[PDB]
Amino acid sequence: TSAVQQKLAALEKSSGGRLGVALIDTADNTQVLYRGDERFPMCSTSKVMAAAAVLKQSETQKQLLNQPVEIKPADLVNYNPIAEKHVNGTMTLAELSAAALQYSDNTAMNKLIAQLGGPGGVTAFARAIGDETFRLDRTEPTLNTAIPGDPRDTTTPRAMAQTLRQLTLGHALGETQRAQLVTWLKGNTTGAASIRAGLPTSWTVGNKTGSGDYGTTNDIAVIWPQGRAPLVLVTYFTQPQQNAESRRDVLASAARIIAEGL
Ligand SMILES: O=C(Nc1cccc(-c2nnn[nH]2)c1)c1cc(-n2cccn2)cc(C(F)(F)F)c1
Incomplete structure (x- = not known):
């Protein structure tokens, strides 16, 4: 009966799809994982x-x-x-x-x-920074086909959370470049309804959304609570039916549940 991990499981069950979550709390350097090693379409x-x-x-x-x-x-x-x-x-x-x-x-x-x-050049950069899971295989728009079982254009929540950390908090990049990426993420205009919608209004957030076939709805974020060590959160979600509608609400709920546990 794990704390945050049940609630996340119940959310998943309630949604009828497959949810993947990875949080890196940079205070403890603790981590919370739900299907954290499963592959998901990144979109x-x-x-x-x-x-x-x-x-x-x-x-x-x-x-x-x-x-x-x-x-x-x-x-x-x-x-x-x-x-x-x-x-x-x-x-x-x-x-x-x-x-x-x-x-x-x-x-x-x-x-x-x-x-x-x-x-292969995108995948190359991921390998250069220690990410052995990320793989990009196609260009836009076919990389969003999100076909069940298809390994193309996938990663795991654990892998992407670790990489988003290194890119935005660590030094996989040069400080000028890291600061530039952070600025880009913070002024993202998509995903008001995704992770951001499940977090205290006081927290600063930089994020990137994705969506595709099979009702695939994704969000990855780095999160600065006020007066607290920043967080990195990955929420991936995909559904069994090709015709499935987006579930950005699932990503907000996952985030809310993660933020409760902190
Ligand atoms: O290209 C796409 N989607 C897209 C494009 C640009 C931005 C975002 C985005 N950004 N943030 N969240 N979504 C998402 C897209 C979508 C679908 N599809 C089918 C049903 C629902 N979707 C299929 C395909 C493919 F058949 F070619 F694979 C591509």
Whole structure:
């Protein structure tokens, strides 16, 4: 009868899907895990790894984030809220990074993938920082197919929580780059209804959402409570029916339950 872990199990049961959670409380350096070693489709939470990888490149190419990149009609895919505003024009890698992270723009993600030499270049960065679980296999939008059992484009909650920590609290990146990632995450505009909706209003949050087929609804966050050691929280959720609707409420409830236990 584990404290937080039951409640999470009951939430899962109530939802009819599969929930995965990983919290890293950087006070104790304690951890709470629910299906923490199971694989989940990452969907757009993978945008953090791709942006982080371009930042890592920027450390030796100190002019890279300002490099103009052409946005061409053929580049546009299924959800391009920022990039469609610059078709037949250019956007910089900093603007593409913010577009990908703060509006979840898929054409922006693909430009980050291209800059890293394909999906294998995103996976490469993950390995370079000790993440042996993350794998990116496809570009946008097919990486969101979220097919049950499919290992493509998956990670585990434990692995992603550990990596989000190193990227945002640790030193997988250069301080200038880490601070830049933190700033990007904090001004994310998506996921008001996800993790953020389940946390005390007083806490500062940087997060990245994802969604896909099979009602896949994901959120990953680093959380600064006031007067307290920051937290890192991963909440992944996916459902048995291809036609399933999003359940952002499940992610808020998981977060609320985690925040109770603290
Ligand atoms: O591309 C997609 N979704 C997307 C695009 C941009 C941002 C976000 C996002 N950001 N934050 N939360 N969601 C999500 C997407 C979605 C679906 N799908 C089918 C049913 C429900 N969904 C399928 C596919 C695929 F068939 F090609 F695989 C792609």
